[PDB]
Symmetry: D2
Subunit: 169 residues, 4 copies
């Protein structure tokens, strides 16, 4: 269930290697989670859906971090709303969507870090382009979970995630 | 999903290692598919199938007829009560696999130096091959097979459930 | 390499689910990896370590210091024995030496109702044991195959590491 | 060792899915040979003199030798065989310059194609061909039992297999 989904998140925040001085731009899960495992780290979210937004700020509340997270609107023109530059960046997919990556590699100070997940054929095709241009590393995770069927258990193989992780030059 | 069907038999067929003058018992899950291709891929061979439904037997043998391998297949009923019909000792056995008593029964009929290839689809099934491997010798391999899968604007590579496959020679 | 050694730590931390006033027993392979992160990821926690080597205990605590986590870790010797000298019952346990004679039943007697243990297996022998302890105390098993680029010449391949099995449970 | 290589060929041959009296152009000798065993023929193209020497060696050892023709390197050698192939295998490098276009040219419509890709590069290329000409991409994650006092399951490298019929 949400199992699969927590195992992905753990891999994302690990890649990102939070320091406390630093501010995330998640492009409402990876942002919120970055707000519970490291103090003095703030997350900026960008979300084109009002409804999904009402949701990110909503759950921001459970873990008492709501006033660190800023839920913004959609890429990439939302960035101009945010004058304060980023240090670490998460794109959990949506790399294929134009003007978006370009726009954000720009808002990123050199020495600034990046992690991108890709779980489509097109998504992953992206990761290799960006990777082959700016460097960084690609690793991937094949995760399966235990599934019962009346009198039988099997190992449901989740979809694979590729993860780009780069430092900027 | 029918691509998984294709790819899995092949591996099964790779594994079985069909030669001149050999007989295959093809026992259990979807009895006939491996028999029919065993019969196809190789000249001068015999297959026996074990099928419960009077009418699932009436689709295995009908199909054989078509590929022209009706000559060399028999369709018996369900094992191991149907092993007691078939008199000659088989050369190779395939199980697609944990029914009460079907292994030991079928196995009391394989002669020294015979070969059997079994496939697991559940964990209960997987853990068994590990224990029949312990005594009986043999070697276990694994197959995750993925097929493109296009939801709307995006392909992913959707994984089938993995398949476990035990291939040993006896003695 | 050290990158599945990072990534495996991550999944084990997320699984252990650290909360306030909690005490981890971190037992077995590489005792300390999970502990100092467990400690260095959540204010207000104590972790317990069980290492056999006098020289390895000296380096775990060294690193707990160098992470300002010196004052919430005890570094004991090997279980199951070293359980007998640690007085307070653990809140969560993690095993990564998953099958030493005795460690588990021992580790286990010490765990309260509705307490949590997450274990790692990397071999089949370990893996089929999680499956047996799974069948007693409940809980759930998932598995991780992690790959990294491997540029053997002009051609990168994606290069799989050995899988890893993880049992997480509530007593 | 050669095991995982056995599973590999077992798969290609299925997707290749031979027909009686069909010609194959296999662009080490594995699949040409394999093609030839299970009245069909095979044309091997091989840059490698020392492997060339080797495939005829195997075709004889196994015994379909006057059914196999070990050619030289592609795509240059392509023009040599004036007789059109009915089915192509690329297990070889499909990113190798001019190799792919040059043989899709020799392939009649209704002719089939199995392509194997086992690198990041070769796989990314395998998607480019798929987009233009069609066909299907599947991938197989094969591991094997590997034993000190323990057994573990060594994951082989994954194969992306492209299979397509020509329109
Ligand atoms: Ca010469
Ligand atoms: Mg009737």
């Amino acid at each position: 269930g949400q199992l699969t989904k927590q195992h992905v998140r753990a891999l994302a925040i690990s890649a990102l290697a939070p320091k406390p001085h630093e501010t995330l731009w998640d492009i409402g899960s990876i942002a919120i989670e970055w707000l519970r495992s490291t103090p003095q780290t703030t997350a900026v979210c960008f979300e084109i859906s009002e409804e999904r937004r009402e949701r990110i700020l909503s759950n921001a509340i459970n873990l008492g971090v709501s006033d660190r997270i800023a839920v913004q609107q959609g890429a990439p023109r939302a960035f101009d709303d945010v004058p304060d530059n980023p240090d670490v960046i998460f794109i959990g997919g949506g790399l294929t969507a134009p003007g978006v990556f370009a726009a954000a590699w720009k808002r990123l100070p050199v020495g600034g870090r990046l992690v991108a997940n890709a779980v489509t054929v097109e998504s992953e095709q992206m990761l290799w382009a960006l990777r082959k241009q700016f460097g960084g590393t690609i690793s991937s995770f094949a995760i399966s979970h235990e599934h019962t069927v009346g009198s039988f258990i099997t190992m449901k193989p989740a979809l694979p995630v590729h993860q780009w992780t780069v430092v900027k030059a």
